[PDB]
Amino acid sequence: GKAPVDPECTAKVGKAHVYCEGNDVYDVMLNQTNLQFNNNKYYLIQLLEDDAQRNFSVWMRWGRVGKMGQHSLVACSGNLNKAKEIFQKKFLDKTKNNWEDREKFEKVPGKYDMLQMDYKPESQLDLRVQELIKLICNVQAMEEMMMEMKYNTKKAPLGKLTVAQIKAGYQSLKKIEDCIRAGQHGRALMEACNEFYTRIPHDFGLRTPPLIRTQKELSEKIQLLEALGDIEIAIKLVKTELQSPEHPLDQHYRNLHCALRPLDHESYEFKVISQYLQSTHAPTHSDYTMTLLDLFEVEKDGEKEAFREDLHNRMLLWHGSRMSNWVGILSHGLRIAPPEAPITGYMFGKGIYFADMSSKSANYCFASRLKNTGLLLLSEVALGQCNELLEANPKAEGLLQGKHSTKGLGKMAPSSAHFVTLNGSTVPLGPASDTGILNPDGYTLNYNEYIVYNPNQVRMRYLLKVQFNFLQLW
DNA sequence: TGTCCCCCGCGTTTTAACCGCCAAGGGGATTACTCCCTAGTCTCCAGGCACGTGTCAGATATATACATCCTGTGCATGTATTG
């Protein structure tokens, strides 16, 4: 794709380009880590030829990942052959792999590993959908969030990654899961951790990179990788388009390929949805309120044929996520976790996750005081017969045996006596009350949650535009 | 308490003090005298002292402008370790 030049080479950012030849783009990033000996270092290499004058150069820059480091610019006055030689020689020295056949890369212990990078207007639409698309399709905000994913929360310091790089990361998490499952904290565990930290760049400052020892860190790493994938899909979706759009967002909307229609505030549907939002605000999430500003009808192509209409127990359940990634869902729908992803990160397995209490799912929006706009999606989910779970058991999926979804039994939850109906789907109104489920052996889940596995059992139905209103801070 | 060097103990080498004596004459030491300077006298008056007197230099706040002490603080730097 679009090949960017490292901006840090100020002497060449505007007069020079990264070299390419078909497949082979002479740009590469290497990472190494060995917690046994506490190495965690990167090495970027880029061949740049000037645009204006015929002159090639090799740029190298190295240091601890996150902390910018020592750089070198070697000019050649157009000696492309020597420069390419130097490039390949250094690549081999640092990797033990030849550069030209980069396709068949094999990392070796005690050497750097490679990684893979991404380097007449009649705007006819309802004004409300226009505001929605402009909100979610704001490329500036996506860039700013990506920059925050490097300098605010150091999860991806050096840059972005590819889908396949994420898949290799998942492979390493699988190896970590296998290792940890046997509770052995010796040498193999340290090497597996080395492989993880090699594939996904982290910045530990100086404190020896710690061993991944419990399930919580596994799941956190998994969520980090998921956020990486989300950013990747969001930037893939926001690709701009030409051909007389007179409002490029209309093509972006086609890319959503999902009808989203404005609803009137006085319609039964709007009022009932507001009732459901308000009645189900958990009392233990009282640091903020939420107001329903607007509500949009959802019609996603292909989902109708897939819905398990035959299955009973159909209810409308929440799903929250940050303002930016929603563009992906509306174009592709919700997906089960990556198969290559370790099962043991999900205390009750993979699949699609929903709540019936607005604030619990709403916590996954990460709205802010400065940025007070968030979205909650409502979907009709045919749960069918639920399997009842008292205590965490990541293996819930084997226990289904004919059931179609899992229920995690929370202390606080609405009782079916208050349930209402919307278009023949069950709407589980609150308030939450005690459910008389308790555990005389272990802990008790704070709140119920429902998980489905077949993607065909979800049908998105309305998208909620929500003002999160925070309060006094001191 | 520790250091180290400088002063002590001692035998040695060199020098001039000391011892014994002599000799020259400058000046100390003696004598006599004489005159002028001071003692002695007396007189006279103004310098100098006791007593008054007034003011301004200095004594007494008084407020003021530093100058000083004292403590705390933030920081460029010495060390650690890595690419």
Nucleotide nearest to A63 (CA to C1'): B83
Separation of A466 CA and B28 C1' (Å): 139
Angle at A194 between CA A91 and CA A177, to 5 degrees: 130
> Is A279 annotated in some ligand binding site?
no
Alpha carbon distances (Å) from A156 to A13, A107, A147? 22, 21, 9
Is the CB atom of residue A71 positioned under 7 angstroms from any atom of strand B? no
Whole-angstrom Cα distance, residue A38 to residue A211?
Answer: 12
CA of A41: nucleotide with nearest C1': B83
Q: Taking the alpha carbons of A314, A316, A318, A319 in that order, is the dihedral positive or negative? A: positive
CA dist., res. A102 & res. A80, Å (int):
19
Q: This structure's resolution (angstroms)?
A: 10.0
A60 strand B contact, CB < 7 Å: no
> Which residues of A participate in catalysis according to the annotation?
449
Which among A230, A71, A69, A263 has a CA at the least distance from the CA of A163? Answer: A230
Site of tokens 């959908």: A129
Whose structure tokens read 């929360």? A153
Neighbouring residues of A310: CB distance < 8 A, sequence distance ≥ 6: none
Euclidean distance between CA atoms A289 and A461, whole angstroms: 23
